Amino acid sequence: IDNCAVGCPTGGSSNVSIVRHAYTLNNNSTTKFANWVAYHITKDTPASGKTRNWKTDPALNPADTLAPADYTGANAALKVDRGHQAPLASLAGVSDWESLNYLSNITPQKSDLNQGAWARLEDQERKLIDRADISSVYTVTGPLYERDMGKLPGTQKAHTIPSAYWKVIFINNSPAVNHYAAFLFDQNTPKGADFCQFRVTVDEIEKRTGLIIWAGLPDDVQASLKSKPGVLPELMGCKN
Amino acid sequence: IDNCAVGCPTGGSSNVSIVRHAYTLNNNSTTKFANWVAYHITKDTPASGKTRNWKTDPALNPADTLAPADYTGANAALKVDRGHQAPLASLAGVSDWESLNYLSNITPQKSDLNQGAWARLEDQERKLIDRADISSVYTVTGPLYERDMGKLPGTQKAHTIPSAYWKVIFINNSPAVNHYAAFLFDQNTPKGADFCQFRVTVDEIEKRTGLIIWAGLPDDVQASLKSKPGVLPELMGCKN
Numbered sequence: 428i429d430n431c432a433v434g435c436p437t438g439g440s441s442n443v444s445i446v447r448h449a450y451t452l453n454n455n456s457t458t459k460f461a462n463w464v465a466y467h468i469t470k471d472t473p474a475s476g477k478t479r480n481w482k483t484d485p486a487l488n489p490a491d492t493l494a495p496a497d498y499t500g501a502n503a504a505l506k507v508d509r510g511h512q513a514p515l516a517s518l519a520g521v522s523d524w525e526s527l528n529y530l531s532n533i534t535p536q537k538s539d540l541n542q543g544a545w546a547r548l549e550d551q552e553r554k555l556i557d558r559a560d561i562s563s564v565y566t567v568t569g570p571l572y573e574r575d576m577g578k579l580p581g582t583q584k585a586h587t588i589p590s591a592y593w594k595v596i597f598i599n600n601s602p603a604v605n606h607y608a609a610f611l612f613d614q615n616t617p618k619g620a621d622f623c624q625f626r627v628t629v630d631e632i633e634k635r636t637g638l639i640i641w642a643g644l645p646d647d648v649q650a651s652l653k654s655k656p657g658v659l660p661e662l663m664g665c666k667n
Numbered sequence: 668i669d670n671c672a673v674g675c676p677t678g679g680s681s682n683v684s685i686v687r688h689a690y691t692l693n694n695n696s697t698t699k700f701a702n703w704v705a706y707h708i709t710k711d712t713p714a715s716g717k718t719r720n721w722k723t724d725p726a727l728n729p730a731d732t733l734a735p736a737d738y739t740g741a742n743a744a745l746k747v748d749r750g751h752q753a754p755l756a757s758l759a760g761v762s763d764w765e766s767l768n769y770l771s772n773i774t775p776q777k778s779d780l781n782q783g784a785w786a787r788l789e790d791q792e793r794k795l796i797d798r799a800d801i802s803s804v805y806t807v808t809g810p811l812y813e814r815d816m817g818k819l820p821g822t823q824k825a826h827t828i829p830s831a832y833w834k835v836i837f838i839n840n841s842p843a844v845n846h847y848a849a850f851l852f853d854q855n856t857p858k859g860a861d862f863c864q865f866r867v868t869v870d871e872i873e874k875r876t877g878l879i880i881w882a883g884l885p886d887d888v889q890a891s892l893k894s895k896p897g898v899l900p901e902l903m904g905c906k907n
C-alpha cells in the first residue's frame with residue numbers, strides 16, 4: 428500500500444511508520460501525536476454517515492499515544508476538538524476506515540479551526556476527486572510545535588499540543604507534472620477565515636518541521652518546485 | 668491530427684486552419700503572417716542539422732502570404748531575421764518537416780529576439796521532452812500587432828510586421844491537471860535578456876490578441892487558470 432506515490436516524508440521521529448489503507452502515519456512518542464499523516468483519496472474512498480468511536484491505536488505502545496480518557500475536560504478547558512489529521516468523510520470508504528478514529532490520527536485542534544477553515548479545505552480537497560480528469564488526490568498533513576499551547580487537563584501523560592497544522596496536496600501522478608498546493612494554519616485561526624489566505628510553499632513547511640516531503644522526487648524537481656506556491660488552489664475556488 | 672489536445676484557439680481571422688504533422692496554423696491574409704501556430708513536441712519530433720529552404724506555402728493563395736523574394740534587404744534595413752513560429756529543431760523529425768520553412772511559419776523577427784531570449788526559451792521548451800515523466804509538450808505561439816514596426820523594403824505586398832510574440836505551453840495531457848506557462852516578448856527585447864522575466868498570464872495574451880486559447884476546456888477551468896501564471900517555468904530553470 429503506497430499512500431504517498433512519490434515517497435513518504437523522511438525526518439520523522441519514529442523510524443517505522445504505520446501503513447493502512449486509510450493512511451500511512453509516523454508517530455511521535457514524545458508529543459503523543461503523529462509527525463505526519465499521508466493519505467490517498469480516490470473516487471471509491473469517500474463515505475458519509477460514519478460514526479466516531481474514538482479508540483487507542485492498537486498498533487502503538489499505549490504509553491506513546493493518547494487514550495480516549497485523556498481528552499476528558501479538554502473542550503471546556505482549551506476549547507479544542509478531537510481533530511482528525513486524515514479526514515473521516517474523504518476516506519471512510521476504505522476497509523480499515525475505523526482506524527481514522529484511532530487517537531494516533533487525532534490531536535487537540537481548536538474548535539474554530541477544526542470546524543472552520545480546516546473543514547472548508549477538507550471539503551474542497553474532497554471535491555477535487557469529483558472532477559472527471561482527477562483520479563487521485565495525494566495529501567500529507569501534520570502539526571507544527573512552535574509555542575506552548577498548554578496541556579490537556581485529563582491526563583498525566585507528557586504531551587505537546589500543536590501550535591499549527593499544514594497540508595500538502597497534489598493530484599493524480601506527481602507534483603513533478605501535476606498541480607499541487609500547500610497550506611499552513613495557526614491553531615488560533617478565526618472561525619470564518621478564508622482558507623485561501625493560508626497558502627504557503629512546501630519549502631516553508633519542511634523548514635518548520637524538519638521533514639522532507641515528496642522524498643522520492645529527483646533533486647532538481649525538489650529544488651525548483653518546493654519553493655514555488657502551486658496553482659491547485661485555483662481549482663479549489665481560490666484567486667490570485 | 669491533433670496538435671492542440673484541449674482545443675485549438677478560436678478567434679483567428681481565417682475560418683480554416685492548415686493542419687500538418689509539423690503544426691496547425693491559422694493564417695491572416697491581411698497581415699500576411701499566421702495568427703497562431705500550434706504544435707506538439709514528442710520524443711520523436713526533435714531533429715538537428717536540417718537545412719532551411721525558405722518557400723512560399725503551397726497550401727495558401729500566393730496573395731495572402733509572403734514569398735522568399737519579399738525578404739530581400741530586410742535584415743539590413745530592419746535588423747530582422749526570418750523567424751520561425753513553430754521551431755525547426757524541435758519538430759524537424761516529422762514527415763512534413765519542410766513545411767517548417769514555409770513562409771507561413773515565418774515572420775520578420777528582430778535578430779536580437781530571434782537569437783536571444785526567444786531561442787533560449789525554445790531550448791528549454793525542447794529540453795522538457797528529455798524528462799522521463801514528460802511525454803508531450805503542447806505549444807501555441809503567435810504575434811501581436813500593437814505598434815507600427817515599419818515595412819519590409821523588398822515587397823509591394825500589404826503586410827503588418829509583428830510588434831511582439833507570445834507562447835503558451837503545457838505538458839502531457841491538459842493544463843487542467845498539468846503544469847503550464849505563458850510568455851510574451853516585445854520585438855525590441857535585448858539580446859541578453861533572461862526569458863524568465865517575461866512570464867505572463869494566458870488571460871493577458873487573450874485580451875491583447877482577441878483569441879481564446881485552449882478553447883475546449885470546461886468554463887470553470889478556463890476562468891480559474893487563465894489568470895494564474897503557471898509553474899512550468901520553474902522546471903525550465905526560472906526562480907520565483
Ligand SMILES: [Mg+2]
Pocket residue numbers: 509510511541542546
Ligand atoms: Mg476535523
Ligand SMILES: [Mg+2]
Pocket residue numbers: 750751781782785786
Ligand atoms: Mg528562431
